Amino acid sequence: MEDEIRKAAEILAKSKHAVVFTGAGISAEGLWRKYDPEEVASISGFKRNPRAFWEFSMEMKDKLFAEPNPAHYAIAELERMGIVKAVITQNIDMLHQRAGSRRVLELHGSMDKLDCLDCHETYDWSEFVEDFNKGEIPRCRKCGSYYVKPRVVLFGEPLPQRTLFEAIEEAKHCDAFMVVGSSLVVYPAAELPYIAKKAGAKMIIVNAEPTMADPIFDVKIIGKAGEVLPKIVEEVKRLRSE
């Protein structure tokens, strides 16, 4: 990746409007999973078994309570340098903002806000996180319903149109598009790199494993984001020195 990292840094260095696209892989992490996200984290599943969704979240607490890693800081640095103008993410933990990124387009929402499906009461995550931490499943303090849904896009749910539009435009007008930690198997998000490819942007991908979209990237890197990204950023700094 020595050569690739250098090449990736060279593209970003010259770009005028780079966009980053991140997935679950940005964070390094029986055989089959006890909780199948396509079921417990699907809208049909939630409208039928809300508690299953929360039990699943609790099992993923370490990831939900994870803090920014070097990849998030590297990405925030690239924006600060004016090289990265937008970060499109499928993630819902707000780690990009928590790391310093400003223009973050959350394709799938975030845990920040929640609504009771039955009485429509809205809540802030801060109102349930302490219960959630001790294994208590959030329940509406108004009507007692277990249908307390966070404003995150579940499988089978339409993505927020406002965010989707801006993400599409960023892809349509960027001159460099870098995928970080995304296996690109979640749609419609997975279509954004292709829109950028169609736009003529230079393509870069950093992922632990190869993807079916790999063929369209100008530079491909296999590895952990948290280890790869800072390396790139450091090579970008040198390209912007005296």
Partner: peptide, 9 residues
């Protein structure tokens, strides 16, 4: 109208 789905080739 774009619903979230997962698909692997």
């Amino acid at each position: 109208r774009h619903k979230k789905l997962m698909f692997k080739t």
